[PDB]
Structures are given as structure tokens and as C-alpha cells.
Ligand binder design. Structure first.
Ligand SMILES: Cc1cc2nc3c(=O)[nH]c(=O)nc-3n(C[C@H](O)[C@H](O)[C@H](O)COP(=O)(O)OP(=O)(O)OC[C@H]3O[C@@H](n4cnc5c(N)ncnc54)[C@H](O)[C@@H]3O)c2cc1C
Ligand SMILES: Cc1cc2nc3c(=O)[nH]c(=O)nc-3n(C[C@H](O)[C@H](O)[C@H](O)COP(=O)(O)OP(=O)(O)OC[C@H]3O[C@@H](n4cnc5c(N)ncnc54)[C@H](O)[C@@H]3O)c2cc1C
Ligand SMILES: NC(=O)C1=CN([C@@H]2O[C@H](COP(=O)(O)OP(=O)(O)OC[C@H]3O[C@@H](n4cnc5c(N)ncnc54)[C@H](OP(=O)(O)O)[C@@H]3O)[C@@H](O)[C@H]2O)C=CC1
Ligand SMILES: NC(=O)C1=CN([C@@H]2O[C@H](COP(=O)(O)OP(=O)(O)OC[C@H]3O[C@@H](n4cnc5c(N)ncnc54)[C@H](OP(=O)(O)O)[C@@H]3O)[C@@H](O)[C@H]2O)C=CC1
Lengths: 487, 490
């Protein structure tokens, strides 16, 4: 049983690098292949995976650029004397973003080098049992053998079958390196990427429009979703409901060129949406499992949504082949989750541990202009599982102290917690719609890991004055409640 | 056949809380509230310390400072600002005050709608079940009540030294200052001192902090020193181990000129170059001395005027209860006061047996670099559980928001203290970084659930968010590695 490597990691992303780093602690020959196939417009990036180069990192960063804008406005009533209007510079921003990314790109490379992990910038493709072919960037092929493999190739944006889409639209992959300011833009899609992007685009000052197929943030508590929606609409994001692009043609070429988008809905009507400068097409992602030669090793995969089914230990049907991250069928598409998986995977293989990755109740927060953090079940999802009769939903609005001097957005920040009456009112849902939502939510997610109950929650005391405290005093229930408007 | 079934002496955090609840059970309630002026004569409205001269103001100015840092940050994110943006104290405090008034009135209005009698008068017991309310012009009125709740809270303390009351100010005064404080010296080193020192500086002033001994006495000392080093790195000067002995006025004026002189533990003296404003907050004393306590028989620690109390907030005199800062051995925290207050009323007229849990109440200090914490201090844990039994996991972290501006890497800090003898139960929680409070709160809940280290680890983090490092604390102090690691690891 002698191969070139104990473990080959296909994909240098969130999960891939994690597995690598850990695997490395136990003196094992490991190599990670990572390669970034270009977007149709030809955009590329470095080691690090989606989060690092065209996902969370960029997104939060720009999100922050937008927040900072609102901060400039806020500063006036706090005594800072600013100029009625500060202009934004796309160029400069992206530069700083990328600058950082590069630092991360290198960092990782260095990290792998120090941990004695072979890194090869090449496309991995299985060719047969225990054997994989790495295609160089110049086309040079090289074959490698390994006792075990970890498929960590993540996924890429998906386009609409419609004409012109690939040729003149962009996706998140391209957004974060756009060499020019996007200009008036249309964003097609309504889940977190679409909303978040649409959000910060607007926050930085652009004319933004979101075209939704159906409902927003499908998957998440629909009420919270709609609150996010209304807020975006109230802060200059235009929405076109129930429509889907049918064709996108180029009226004029140019950096911010001019595109003509047309769409049809469930209504048979059609609209030639006034042209836009850029069309943000993030509307889904497809797992990169199609062209990595899985047939040659016998790995089974959901042929419809290329996701890979897997044991609770991340093992595929093929004993020596494991997978991690987004690719996983049924799991969540989240960096932390991928890094944990990866991490603990190595721990089990080479570290003799029995801990598996718990994918229940993992926090998450979507960075819309008005952030949204949540952990656990969504209200409707709770009534389904536990029965309307047995759910009690405590909620309230709140007003961040920070917003008063500015005098804005009262009664918008919202918080609710859903409890299971048949279980000590165990809090099985947590939702907050306010500033720093993530920082607020993290803590409570831990609490959910300890079976936090409503009485315990109440028994905790709040930190004042700080947004997260309304959770320490949720007294009004939806079931009866009446007003939770501002006392 | 008493006048009211409950009278509440104090329109503060706790007081108003009790009123509001009590009021739900249809009982005749009256809350007296009166604000004795500061020596410089400043006053304020209904609402208590937190509202008029504590948390509210404090945070708001703290926010004024953070926005300053925010303007600076915006440049590398693409906003084109001017190298220097000036700050206007006047405008800021107007805004702050404005808000406060909004609170002042809100409370009055609430009391009126809840049907609670509100009388702006100073309360003083005269005899069993009887209290004398001295109005503002000196008119007296007496009231009778079946029960009383003493919620007077405390007030700033001055140093015995000369000139202190005549030329210095305290937090009481700070948040209404009619003029920019100018170069100021802040005497004292606990939360109030450092917080105010902090935002003063962040707003652009020359600030110095004079410490008698250690900083943040009472808090996990290492965290405290970090806070300090941070303040020092961001232009707050500190004088260690000194105490003012006299403050003389070199020149009157709105920002006038004072000459401060101090002595240490070392017999040496320094005539600290004058300053424009000397912020003297340095402790607080319970207002329990001049309220007619002897006439009803309430016992109180004569040394620290705090009121000893049962686990139900009852004093030694069965119909008299106390709440808030005044409580002996409790925490001087608004939310705590309001919980107590609320729960109290719940017990009295709501037939409940829930009592307020003063264990592991989270807190955060709003210094320029915020510090949140809950549970025991590292040192406090070893004392309790024994060095041998404590494992402390910690790490540095770099808020994504800080990279683009490129500043303060390896400065935010996070540690968790566990009890090896109890499945590494997390008994301590400390975070030094932005948004500390919002980070801490959640965990404080966890603590109430007996959060264990393995549970913690089992929790998945939200990325990219400061809070997440807690979801991956792997390096222990005892095995000391470097927790210095920019960039990347996994
Ligand atoms: C816009 C956006 C915002 C996001 N925001 C958040 C967030 O805010 N918080 C959060 O938790 N998550 C966020 N995510 C999702 C999260 O970043 C991903 O879930 C995570 O990176 C998945 O990690 P992974 O390792 O499985 O996949 P990846 O991290 O993408 O790893 C895949 C890597 O392998 C490479 N690869 C693919 N095929 C091959 C092959 N054939 N040969 C060699 N290499 C290959 C890819 O180029 C890539 O480097 C965001 C995602 C996006 C798109
Ligand atoms: C500068 C500063 C900053 C602070 N920051 C925070 C913070 O960020 N977070 C936090 O949680 N806590 C903070 N606190 C602590 C908090 O303010 C106190 O815990 C809280 O006010 C306690 O309120 P209380 O109800 O016990 O008494 P208070 O709220 O202080 O109210 C006492 C009230 O009773 C009135 N009164 C007293 N005697 C009489 C009498 N004889 N007759 C009529 N009325 C009377 C007083 O005038 C006052 O209205 C801060 C405190 C200070 C000083
Ligand atoms: C969650 O979400 C994941 C689902 O996979 P994912 O890739 O995010 O797909 P999703 O549909 O959940 O995310 C894509 C978003 O784009 C919209 N969208 C998707 N396909 C099209 C299309 N052909 N035309 C127009 N709009 C479209 C969706 O609208 P809509 O909600 O109507 O599908 C949705 O808002 C699961 O893995 C689970 O973890
Ligand atoms: C904690 O602290 C609370 C105590 O309340 P508090 O009234 O603020 O007392 P604290 O000692 O907690 O707050 C006072 C702060 O001012 C300093 N200080 C106190 N007296 C003087 C003085 N005469 N000259 C110079 N500096 C001084 C203290 O330094 P030092 O550490 O040297 O006492 C401390 O830094 C308790 O309720 C408990 O919960």
C-alpha cells in the first residue's frame, strides 16, 4: 500500500486548506491542489478559495465600505463637521480590497510551505483508483497517487440559460475585481449574495435594482426576510417582483457599457428594463463535481444537484475518498462549517479522535444593509416541526442607542426568539435584525448548543446599553402581544 | 388605609422599573425623584444616573469618538475625506442632551399613563410608614405607604483635597459641560475614569489619566493592562502612582486654567502643568445618609452607605426594600437594578417566587478598545478553583474591518477560563475588541446554561465576525504558544 501521498486534497479552499493544516500536524505527506478556472470574462484569483477571493472577505469588506458611508453621515450630529457630500471611489476601494486579498493569498501559500504541505497550482482529476492527474496551468500533466483523498472543490456561480448572460453579465466572481465602477446596476436573484451585493452597491451610492423570481431569502424565516426587504426598499434599492430575465443584449460596449435587459413574469407580460451599466447575475451556485473524473474512482454523486452524498463522517461511498464543504449534499454552504469539517476530519483520520462535525443549529448572518443574524429554526419551520399549538414566539423592536443622535430608523431593528412550549420553552429559534448582527448572534448560538431555555434566557441579565440586550427581556408574545412599537 | 400601597424613593433605573411593574397590578404607587445639584449646580430630569449622567451619555460620546475613527477609516474604503475633520463639543453635547430630554419626558409620560403618581421631591422618612417629600421650593408634604422601596442610587465622590469641589467636575457635570473641556486630566482608574478619558481623547483632546494604583481594580488585571497599553498607544498620557493634593485656579474662564499638584507613594511631588478641566470622578457614595433612615429603623453599613438586604431585596425592616447600586454586596449596574426592581414587584403583587440572580452578570467597559466580560477573572478563578485546575484558552484577533485601514493588528484579545475539574466549564469570559458588549451578551446566556469548553468548541462560528474566535480557541496559556499570527492558518 505505498503511494506518493497519504492524502491529496483537491481544492485549496476553506475546507481544503483546513484539512491540510491539520493533517499536517501529524507528520503525514500531504499535497493540496488548487486551481482557479477563469470566469467567462476571464477573471482569476489566488490560493484561498471562494471565501477568501470572491466571497465573505470581499463582501464584508465592501459591506463595511457602505456602512462607513452611513457613518460619515451619522458623524454630523455627533459634532464632526463634514461636507454635505462625500463621494465614493470604486477604484480606490477595490484596490484596497484586492490588496488585502493578495496578502491572504500569499499568507496561505506561506502557511502551507511552513507546515510542509506540497502545494501545486493545478487542476485535479481522478483517473483511477488512488490515482489523480493534475493539469498544470500550461497544460502539463502530472499523475499522483495517494492513500486517501479529500474532494474540496466547492462550487461556482451559475448563469441563466438566457442569451447574452455569459457574455455581458458578471457574477460575484467578477464583482470583487471589477476594474470599473459598476454604475446603474440590476441584480438578478434574491438570496443572500444578491441581497447583500445589491445592498452595498447601493450603500456606496449606485442606482440599484433587484429583480426577484419569487420570494426573498428562500430558506430563511420569511418574515425576517420581508423585513430585510422593506428596509432595502426604504433605503433606495428598487425592486421588481416576479420577473426573470429572458435576454440581455449589449446596446453599447464600454467599461461601464450599456446593457438592455428584458424580462417576463408568471403573468406573460414583458418589460424592456431600461438599460443598466452592469448586470449582477448571482442567482445560485453549482458544485464542481462534474469534471474531476469521479467516474474513474466510483464515487457516487447526486446527478441532479452535483452535491456529494456522504456519511456523518464525510466519507463518500468510496472508502478512501472524503469530501468537504459546500460540495456536501444536505449540509450547509458555510466557511466555518467547511473549516470545521476539514479540521475535525483530519483529527479523526490521523489524530485518533471520534468527534464529528455537528451541523445542527450553526449560526449564520446575512450582511444586508441592515444585518440579519439567526440560529436554529425559523418560526414557520418551528410550527411545522413542533406544531403551531406548541410554539411561543417572544419578540420586540429596538432602537440602537447609536441611532438616536442621528435620529434615524426607529422601530426597525427587530429581534425575536421562538420557543418550544412542550420543552420548557427551549429556545429553538433565534433571530435578530440589527447592527452587528453576527457579533450578537454568535454568543446565543453557543447557548443553543447548551439547550438554552426561555426561563434561563430571562434569567440572564443584559449589558446596557447594547443592542443584544433586548434578548434578555423578551416579554411580549406574538400570540397575543399587541404592540411592540416603542412603548 | 395608607396613602399609597407602595412609595418608591428614587426615580432611577431601579425605581422606575419597580413602578412600571407594580403598576400592572393596579396598586396605588408613587415615585419620588429629586436631583440634588452638583457643587457647580448642575441638575437634570427624571430618569436617574444612567439616563442623564451615566450610560446613555457616556455611550453616546463614546460613539462620537468611534465615528471619528470611522471617518479616518473611510479613506481606504474609497470615501474621499479631508485630511482633518474638526470636532465641535458644543454641537455634540446639544445632541446628547436633546436625546436625554427626550428620555426625561418619556418617563414622565410613561408614569402618567401607567397611573403612577410622580412627584418631583426629595424623600425623607419621618417615622414608620411615613415619609416627607420636600418639594423644590421647600414645601413639605407627608405621605403614608404600606411598603417602601429605597432606590436612591449614589453620587460622585470628591477627594478630601482643597479646590476639588470648587474647580473640578465629575461625571455628573461632564455630560452637560457648556464648553469644550480642553486639555484635561482625569483622576481615577476604574470604568468611569478610563471611559471618559477615552472618549475625550478620541474626540481630539489632550488627555492625561492619573492613577493611584492599579487600573480597573476588580477586573481581570491582564485584560486591564491591555486596555491601558492600548489607551497609551492612542495618545492618552498616564501618570502612575500619584494622587492630587491640591487644585488651585490659575485663571477663571469657561475652559479656565487649573494648576494641579500631586504626591505619590514616594514622597515626591509634581506640579502638573495646569489643565483646563480636571475630571474628578473617582468613586461613588450611596445616598442613604440623609433620607431619614434612623426614623424607621433600617440598618445600613455605616462605612460604605450600602444597604444590606435579603436575597429578596428586603431590608431588616420588613416593609422596606432597597434596589440598585445602594445594595450592599451587589453590582452597580442598570440592567441589574431594573431586573431587581421588576422582579421585586413581580414577587410582591404578582405572586411569583423568582428572585434576581446576581451571579455571572455580563458587563462591558466602553474604553476606546471595548472590553466585555462575564464570570470570573483569571486570577479570581485560580483563587477559587486552584491554579492546577484552571485551563485558559486564548488568542489574538484582527477585525476584518481593520485590515483595509491597516491598523491595530494583534490588539483585540479573547480568552476563556475553564474549570478542569468540571468538564472545563467555562467560568470566565473575556473579550477585548470592537462591539465587545454585543459579543459578550450572548455568551453570558451560555454561561447561565453551564457552557462547557467542548460545547463551546462544538459551536460553529459566524464568519467573518469578531465573535467567532471564541468558537476556535485552541491555544492554552499553560502550554504557551505564540498567539501572534497575522494572516492565515486555516
Ligand atoms: C459571495 C459570497 C459570500 C459569502 N459569504 C459568506 C459569509 O459571509 N459567511 C460564511 O460563512 N460563508 C460565506 N460564503 C460561502 C463560503 O465562503 C463557502 O461556503 C466556502 O468557501 C466553501 O468552502 P470550500 O472549501 O468547500 O469551497 P471553496 O472554499 O470554494 O474551495 C474550492 C477551491 O477549490 C478550487 N477548485 C475547484 N475545482 C478544482 C479542481 N478541479 N482542481 C483543483 N482545484 C479546484 C476552487 O477554485 C477553490 O479554490 C460566501 C460565498 C459567496 C460566493
Ligand atoms: C458615569 C457612569 C457611567 C455608567 N455607565 C454604565 C453603563 O455603561 N452600563 C451600565 O450598565 N451601567 C452604567 N452605569 C452604572 C449605572 O448608572 C447605575 O448602576 C444605575 O444608575 C443604578 O441606578 P439606581 O436606580 O440604583 O439609582 P439611579 O439610577 O442612579 O437613580 C437614583 C435616583 O434617585 C434619586 N434620588 C436619590 N435620593 C433621593 C431622595 N432622597 N429623594 C428623591 N430622589 C432621590 C436620584 O436623584 C436619582 O434620580 C454608569 C454609571 C456612571 C456614574
Ligand atoms: C439553501 O440554498 C441552497 C440552494 O442552492 P442555490 O444554488 O443557492 O439555489 P438558490 O435558488 O437557493 O439560490 C439562488 C437564488 O436565485 C434565484 N434563482 C435560482 N435559479 C434561478 C433561475 N433559473 N432564474 C432566476 N432566478 C433564479 C432564486 O430564486 P427562487 O427562490 O424563486 O429559486 C434564489 O433567490 C441549498 O443548498 C440550501 O443550502
Ligand atoms: C467594584 O468597585 C466598586 C467600588 O465602587 P467605587 O466607589 O468606584 O470605588 P472604586 O475604587 O471601584 O472606583 C474608584 C476608582 O478611583 C480610584 N480612587 C478611589 N479613591 C481615590 C482617591 N482618594 N484618590 C485617587 N484615586 C482614587 C480607585 O483607585 P484604587 O484602585 O487605588 O482604589 C479606582 O481606580 C464595588 O461596588 C465593586 O463592585
Amino acid at each position: 500500500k505505498s503511494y506518493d501521498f497519504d492524502l491529496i486534497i483537491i481544492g485549496g479552499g476553506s475546507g481544503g486548506l483546513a484539512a491540510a493544516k491539520e493533517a499536517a500536524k501529524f507528520d503525514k505527506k500531504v499535497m493540496v491542489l488548487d486551481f482557479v478556472t477563469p470566469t467567462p470574462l476571464g477573471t482569476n484569483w489566488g490560493l484561498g478559495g471562494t471565501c477568501v477571493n470572491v466571497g465573505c472577505i470581499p463582501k464584508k469588506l465592501m459591506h463595511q465600505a457602505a456602512l462607513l458611508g452611513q457613518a460619515l453621515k451619522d458623524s454630523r450630529n455627533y459634532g464632526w463637521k463634514l461636507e454635505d457630500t462625500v463621494k465614493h471611489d470604486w477604484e480606490k476601494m477595490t484596490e484596497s480590497v484586492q490588496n488585502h486579498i493578495g496578502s491572504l493569498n500569499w499568507g496561505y501559500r506561506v502557511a502551507l510551505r511552513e507546515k510542509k504541505v506540497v502545494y501545486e497550482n493545478a487542476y485535479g482529476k481522478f483517473i483511477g483508483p488512488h490515482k489523480i492527474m493534475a493539469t498544470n496551468n500550461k497544460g502539463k500533466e502530472k499523475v499522483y497517487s495517494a492513500e486517501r483523498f479529500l474532494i474540496a472543490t466547492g462550487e461556482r456561480p451559475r448563469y441563466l440559460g438566457i442569451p447574452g448572460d455569459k457574455e455581458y453579465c458578471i457574477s460575484s466572481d467578477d464583482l470583487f475585481s471589477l476594474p470599473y465602477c459598476p454604475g446603474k446596476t440590476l441584480v438578478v436573484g434574491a438570496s443572500y449574495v444578491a441581497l447583500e451585493c445589491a445592498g452595498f452597491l447601493a450603500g456606496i451610492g449606485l442606482d440599484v435594482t433587484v429583480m426577484v423570481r419569487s420570494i426573498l431569502l428562500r430558506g430563511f424565516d420569511q418574515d425576517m426576510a420581508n423585513k430585510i426587504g422593506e428596509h432595502m426598499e426604504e433605503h433606495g434599492i428598487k425592486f421588481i417582483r416576479q420577473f426573470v430575465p429572458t435576454k440581455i443584449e449589449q446596446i453599447e460596449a464600454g467599461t461601464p457599457g450599456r446593457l438592455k435587459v428584458t424580462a417576463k413574469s408568471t403573468n406573460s407580460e414583458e418589460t424592456i428594463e431600461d438599460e443598466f451599466n452592469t448586470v449582477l447575475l448571482a442567482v445560485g451556485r453549482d458544485s464542481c463535481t462534474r469534471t474531476i473524473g469521479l467516474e474513474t474512482v466510483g464515487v457516487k454523486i447526486n446527478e441532479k444537484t452535483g452535491k456529494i452524498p456522504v456519511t456523518d463522517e464525510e466519507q463518500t461511498n468510496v472508502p478512501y475518498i472524503y469530501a468537504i464543504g459546500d460540495i456536501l449534499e444536505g449540509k450547509l454552504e458555510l466557511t466555518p462549517v467547511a473549516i470545521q469539517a476539514g479540521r475535525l476530519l483530519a483529527q479523526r483520520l490521523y489524530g485518533g479522535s471520534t468527534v464529528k462535525c455537528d451541523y445542527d443549529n450553526v449560526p449564520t448572518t446575512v450582511f444586508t444593509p441592515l444585518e440579519y443574524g439567526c440560529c436554529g429554526l425559523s418560526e414557520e419551520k418551528a410550527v411545522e416541526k413542533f406544531g403551531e399549538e406548541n410554539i411561543e414566539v417572544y419578540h420586540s423592536f429596538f432602537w440602537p442607542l447609536e441611532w438616536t443622535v442621528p435620529s434615524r430608523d426607529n422601530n426597525k431593528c427587530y429581534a425575536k426568539v421562538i420557543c418550544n412550549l412542550k420543552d420548557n420553552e427551549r429556545v429553538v429559534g433565534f433571530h435578530v435584525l440589527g447592527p452587528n448582527a453576527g457579533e450578537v448572534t454568535q454568543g446565543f448560538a453557543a447557548a443553543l448548543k447548551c439547550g438554552l431555555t426561555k426561563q434561563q434566557l430571562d434569567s440572564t441579565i443584559g449589558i446596557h446599553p447594547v443592542c443584544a440586550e433586548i434578548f434578555t427581556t423578551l416579554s411580549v408574545t406574538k400570540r397575543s402581544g399587541g404592540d411592540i412599537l416603542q412603548s
